[PDB]
Design a protein around this ligand. Structure first.
Ligand SMILES: [Ca+2]
Ligand SMILES: [Ca+2]
Ligand SMILES: [Ca+2]
Ligand SMILES: [Ca+2]
Ligand SMILES: [Ca+2]
Ligand SMILES: [Ca+2]
Ligand SMILES: [Ca+2]
Ligand SMILES: [Ca+2]
Ligand SMILES: [Ca+2]
Ligand SMILES: [Ca+2]
Ligand SMILES: [Ca+2]
Ligand SMILES: [Ca+2]
Lengths: 273, 394, 276, 265, 272, 273, 272
């Protein structure tokens, strides 16, 4: 009691089993008189260094010192810090040259939107262009299309600028996108191409000594199966946005893993507010 | 991680940079000097040549402090933990059950101290081409401790300043590339010590003991002040005579009760280490008995046989000094008892009264017990002296 | 003499009498196998005491038993005597070829592949080397360039997730250029009667290992150098249910070397241990 | 930050590179009064600390109004254009080529060191081509309040798309007929990336590897942006801000008419 | 049993008169172990690794070096040596009906391994021949390399179609060209064959405990050594070949200490 | 005597100025009841670390603790360990296309040979093609035409296999070797082509003494000026083989050089045997 | 008998009044050591390396610095400085049948080095002038570099055909073109002159293990400070040229304590 720590995250077991609160960068036993004061009441796990899969620890989160871009909703150690980026396209254009092969080139105008809490830092969304069953092509964005420091709730070219142009099927920007001949006679009559995303990558920031943050080497590519495997997803619509969160859940099958359990009626509240 | 290695090695000033460079050339002497520093006069401390280097290395270490308990691994001679014999030579392969039993027995419940510089690795000890002694140790480090990695020629071994007290918990017998080895798993027990900083010593002493003077009665205050000014010279002598049994007297008895009441009311608030300069009288010696000399090896080894480990018992009160610096009045005594004190022992601060009664001194109840840990020798001028790290058992 | 804990002839952090008679993990420490420990719902493990990772896989006995390697690795891998092994394959569909108007480089090809995985553990890249056979002849081998590598593939899933169009494999070079060319006899050969087949040969990959500062890192670790030693000290088992498959390995004893002090299992127990 | 809490919460001033309490006999002397946040190192977001920005031992190219630990250092660069020049040749794909004459300009406080602006070229409301800045067209050492081709030199030329200089900017057929008769091309920036300089204890800055790109989210999520026009040159700065919904962040409070003098002066 | 002059964690007397590993520690050799079935080893006591393979004596005796390596390589004498070869079939050519470069080629190769150790990234350099007249030498590029090629296993497992080799450049482009006289030649009289020249790979080595690294090691600098101080032995079963390399003693010098072997024993030790 | 060593090859002065043998990795003074056991007697220089020049010290080269392919003739400290490699040519086949510029393409069949003691580990020669007192092109072998582990006395394609082709001049193997039309008009008459070799570069394998010999980074290309600026050469022919050696020698002018002198009749026997 | 200010482990009295190395340490300078066959040196006692070349005074005085550097670089007042140049021959041109890019060029170059130290890599930048108009500048690609280029000798050792320089691009391609008016101008009466402009190559030196690394060092940044405070002396006996770069004292300043010489003394100090 207040003297042992089997997980090594700077929060003793009793606090991690009864509730606590950070007061000037030190854990404090949760009292009932802080609720009016404006504080909160977190609980978490006492056998892991970080009980939500996400790359920030229980103490680093609860204290609120991981970063100054992540929403406040992502501090309660039972809520993952996870971004969700998608790609919406339009204004697809063609260009002919007037050859039964490579008879036309394509071009698309894309824009990335993001929902969630934490921001990505160098995004490269792999997307495929599909036509009426036949996958026309796949493409991973090169250096002309990487979008650095995308935020939560916004789009890559901010509201006020033009969409982005994707035309190139090569690791260096060259060799414009080709197309068959029949597929040109198939999109002149009635049909039109579609664009769908399949995966996205991109680093994630992390603090250092004097702030001195670094974002080179860390990667969201390996904390995604771990989070998608244990958490549970929740979505909300507002006719103006698309809120989306993850919340961890206790697996009752094994009699060993120890982690609190919630109610959907409380999961929703703890997720959005 | 040579990245952080080099990235940390430019936030320094020229002095620190050249000193960390020179550390790769004068390691062992720097270490051994940093071991026994504060046990001199105030004279040579601010006067010795290798002071700039100790100072700059300390201010280099103290900069970078970690934020979570972190594990370290290093090989350790079995001598430091009270084992003055062999477990196996460097050409055998395995250790015997008898020696293992002996070791497991002789370190049952102790608390050892470490106060020098140190190099340290972090990964497991694989083919590092360095594993001298058969006692690996697997240690833990608490929050907010110093750590500074130098980017050596090919290896990157970090450098710490062990200034704390450890205790051994768990020992096992493992094998590595054919040979046998013992592995111990130790932690760090917190201690508060002022090696030299006596201004902070006085600050702590006052801030903790000033408000205590009003937990007594004016006759008790007057009497204890009497006993603290001059009476000791005679009073405690009565205690040596085994008064209350052989020759009774109630006057000095009531005086004793005054002191004991005055001491019991307020304990020490935190683990505190005290330094009392003792002499030959207290240890079955004089300035005449041949054993008192500590230049020759046979005397030292006979002493380390007799007293090391055995218990010590005191009939009178203990007036200890906090500042570990050698003062003038003890230029003849050659033993520096170094006691540790837990949160919960009686006593008070005699230098809490405005008025000459003692320069940073603390009281410890009479008729007490000490369990001794380890005896070491340190050189000064022509003569060596015996540092005796001994624990106060409650 | 030689009490329980006083012997541990490797660095698995599990004493010998336990690792030989039956133990269980509790509060991140090992304990004797009682029998009243059955009701709560623990499991009784036995292992080898001369080896550091008694199955072959890249996690030790302690990490697999305790449960401190990852969280997407199925709970059939916690047992020390079952390797943590993925098995990834490729399925083709919707072949599409296009001419150009020659007798060499007279038509370009394009296939639609979709990966899938069966087994226990995940892979954090996929670059399957696939070859395109055409009636007793390999028309071309090809390894996935940058556009077709998938990342964070799960166990029991597909790379283009269920409900998305397949992946398109058409380019032959390293920097994606030089569309796959075909002959002229084979054009007339596959236009009239026959069709092309695709089959995989090998897959690279990775596996995420916890660092010395919490953040797991998975660049520099490969699955291509533990396969040679899992396929040779195990026995394979393949289950089918006409809606999805299953694949597992189980470690068997070598009854020839008396130094091989591995515990032994019978089929009627290995089948139950590798699934449940 | 090695400055105590009393100073950091009531008032302090740097003198002989050491902190000191704030008397009221220095305004006639020419000092200032600073305030900060007593829990964190850098209370504004920018990559310098409270003690660094307070002293003035960070650099010499940063405006004197960036010492107050509540006004961040934040370079803001943009791209201006002139003299588009197209070129025909003689097909329907790749029927002409394009060349633009760009010129950068920096408004803000801090400098930028390797500016590589990503620009996209729109026409009649249809994005034609997006393009980074390759080796040739990336000026360095852009001071605060200047241009890359400084005043008195010919503007810069951007005419190539590939990551190596090859495959000059193509253009379709219909778009040629459009931009020849009626309309014209217009480009715009979308982001810029470049480094910042850090000193050491012996006067040697080193700026190979830092990045202004991973701090901008946090500087722009916790601050209020204040702009100003003069028909001579625009000005724009940031000033920190608190949210009274959290009893944790003890950053002092400002007003509008006080921020306008704490930021521009 | 007193001293150790070679730094391999085994004392001289054992290393010279016969020892055996037991509970990962060496022990003298009795005559009451062949009933249970321990082996009997001898080695050289002025060298760490007595054979030449990158492992030492103790690492090879204990069996803590790998798992897929044949048991027959546990002994300190019988070295570890992966002999890999290349076979070719179904050469198809293709014309474009120029005077030179009038056709391209395509071969279907398949790798195979005999010997003990495993190779972890094979890259065999193959050169084409035509009536005693080479045409092109090519070192397999990032498509045709194979990895984790276990011993006893053709590279594509038994049951899959062979490996198609048709490109030349470092990055696949500029397919294999052929002249005109050679074209007109190879339909009338003769045909092409293939024969390897060299093979470069890697080998898995352990670390502290558990994890192995095969990126940086290479069998390319352990072949001259291994092959200059040994003697080869081949055996044909007419269903699967076998090949090993046994160590032997250069008796000229009197300093070199290595136990000799009568061939009647080298055989019964190499294979089994 | 036996007091000290002014160098640091840990063999003392007298042992190094009068004779010494190596028994069980320890030096020993030289008797005369030893030449019957089967030993030898060396003598070296007590100021340099490595006395002949080659990249192995006196002690390693002396006690035979450096490799296992290097000939027994190189164990003596005065005979430098050094490979001398050459290239032989045959069967130049040309192919004519169908222009006064670049009217044909050439292809040669070469094979490597190595003489001397040491082996090389990445042979990459630099050969040029001379025709009738004129040079056509100089090319340095690329990834296809590099070798591996030339042991002393062998060939890169081992004896039994076909020779190795050489056709392409670029760094990435494309841009086939051109030939001007006039050279073809001259060659077709009955002239010929001569292929000369100018230099070779390739690593040398050194034991790391912690196991796992290393051979990446080291190079012979910087020990050749040194080895060949102080020593003197020896050749030998047999009409069936060839042999080459390099032996050090003294600078009779300088009193700073202390390296014993020899005689031709002794150096021949010490080198070859 | 005093302390070393410059800290080159040679005391000030010796470095100021003549000294001599013997058995790897310095000794005072007697007046009869010249009978043995020794030498006498002087050196600045404030700077470590008095000459400016990348070696120190103890090195250049003891000879431990290398084994392929001419003797006359031992006298510390003589910099070690290689001067390498390029000579041309057999200019050939090749037509192809455009009013631009109408022919290709090909030259036969040969390097040569004079002076003291060798250079372990050579990459000479050459520009082809044509009647007072530079035609194409070129830096030696990977096919035309050399190494271990001894002092005095040439790159292709005597008795071999010269080196062929024809290709422009970094990676070998894009042969050097030429216009159509320059062609009609040179084949009629004129020819092409060539002139190098600079060469840069590393220099070998000892390491922390007992090897000699030759990478990561460059003569390209020790040519400014050597050719700033030093004077050139050139001889030529028509069998071989000779180039040396001696130092001297800047008399103007009062701080420079570097000994001064007379030309008749410096000549003998250099060439001997
Ligand atoms: Ca905890
Ligand atoms: Ca926790
Ligand atoms: Ca164990
Ligand atoms: Ca184990
Ligand atoms: Ca602070
Ligand atoms: Ca602060
Ligand atoms: Ca041995
Ligand atoms: Ca051995
Ligand atoms: Ca010597
Ligand atoms: Ca020597
Ligand atoms: Ca000097
Ligand atoms: Ca000097």
């Amino acid at each position: 009691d207040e003297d042992l720590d089997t997980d090594n995250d700077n929060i003793p077991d009793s606090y991690e089993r009864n509730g606590y609160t950070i007061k000037d960068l030190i854990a404090v036993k949760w009292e009932d008189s802080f609720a009016e004061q404006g504080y909160k009441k977190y609980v978490s796990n006492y056998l892991e260094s970080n009980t939500a899969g996400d790359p920030y620890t229980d103490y680093e989160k609860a204290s609120g010192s991981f970063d100054k871009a992540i929403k406040t909703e992502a501090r309660d150690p039972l809520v993952a810090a996870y971004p969700i980026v998608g790609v919406g396209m339009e204004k697809l254009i063609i260009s002919t040259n007037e050859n039964k092969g490579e008879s036309a080139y394509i071009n698309a105008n894309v824009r990335y939107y993001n929902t969630g809490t934490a921001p990505m830092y160098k995004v490269t969304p792999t997307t495929n262009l599909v036509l009426d069953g036949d996958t026309l092509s796949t493409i991973k964005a090169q250096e002309n299309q990487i979008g650095n420091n995308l935020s939560p709730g916004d789009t890559y070219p901010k509201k006020g600028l033009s969409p982005l142009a994707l035309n190139t099927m090569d690791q260096f920007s060259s060799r414009l996108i080709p197309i068959n001949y029949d597929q040109l006679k198939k999109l002149d009559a009635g049909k039109q191409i579609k664009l769908e995303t399949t995966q996205v990558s991109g680093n994630f920031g992390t603090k250092n000594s004097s702030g001195q943050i670094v974002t080179e080497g860390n990667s969201w590519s390996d904390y995604i199966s771990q989070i998608d495997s244990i958490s549970a997803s929740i979505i909300l619509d507002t006719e103006n946005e698309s809120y989306e969160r993850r919340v961890t859940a206790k697996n009752l099958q094994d009699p060993e893993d120890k982690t609190p359990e919630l109610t959907i009626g409380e999961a929703i509240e703890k997720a959005f507010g | 991680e040579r990245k952080e290695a080099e990235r940390i090695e430019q936030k320094l000033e020229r002095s620190e940079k050249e000193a960390l460079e020179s550390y790769k050339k004068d390691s062992v002497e720097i270490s051994k000097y940093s071991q026994t520093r504060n046990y001199f006069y105030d004279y040579q401390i601010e006067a010795n040549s290798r002071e700039k280097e100790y100072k700059e290395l300390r201010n280099a270490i103290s900069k970078n402090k970690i934020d979570k308990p972190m594990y370290v691994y290093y090989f350790e001679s079995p001598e430091k933990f009270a084992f003055n014999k062999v477990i196996r030579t460097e050409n055998q392969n395995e250790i015997s059950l008898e020696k293992f039993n002996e070791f497991k027995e002789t370190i049952q419940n102790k608390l050892f101290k470490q106060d020098g510089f140190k190099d340290i690795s972090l990964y497991e000890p694989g083919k590092g081409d360095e594993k001298p002694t058969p006692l690996l140790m697997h240690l833990k480090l608490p929050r907010n401790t110093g750590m500074l990695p130098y980017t050596n020629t090919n290896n990157v071994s970090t450098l710490i300043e062990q200034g704390y007290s450890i205790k051994i918990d768990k020992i096992v017998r493992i094998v590595i590339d054919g040979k046998h080895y013992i592995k111990a798993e130790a932690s760090v027990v917190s201690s508060l010590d002022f090696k030299d900083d006596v201004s902070k010593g006085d600050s702590w002493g006052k801030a903790n003991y000033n408000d205590w003077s009003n937990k007594l009665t004016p006759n008790e205050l007057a009497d204890v002040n009497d006993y603290m000014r001059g009476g000791y010279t005679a009073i405690n002598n009565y205690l040596i005579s085994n008064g209350p049994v052989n020759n009774p007297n109630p006057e000095l008895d009531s005086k004793i009760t005054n002191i004991e009441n005055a001491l019991k009311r307020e304990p020490i608030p935190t683990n505190l280490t005290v330094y009392r300069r003792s002499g030959p009288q207290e240890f079955g010696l004089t300035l005449t008995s041949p054993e008192y000399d500590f230049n020759k090896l046979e005397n030292i080894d006979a002493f380390k046989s007799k007293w090391e480990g055995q218990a010590l018992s005191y009939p009178n009160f203990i007036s200890t000094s906090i500042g570990s610096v050698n003062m003038s009045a003890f230029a003849k005594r050659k033993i520096v008892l170094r006691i540790t004190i837990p949160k919960g022992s009686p006593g008070a601060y005699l230098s809490a009264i405005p008025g000459y009664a003692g320069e940073y001194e603390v009281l410890l109840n009479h008729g007490s017990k000490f369990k001794i840990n380890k005896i070491d020798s340190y050189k000064d001028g022509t003569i060596t002296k015996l540092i005796v790290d001994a624990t106060l058992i409650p």
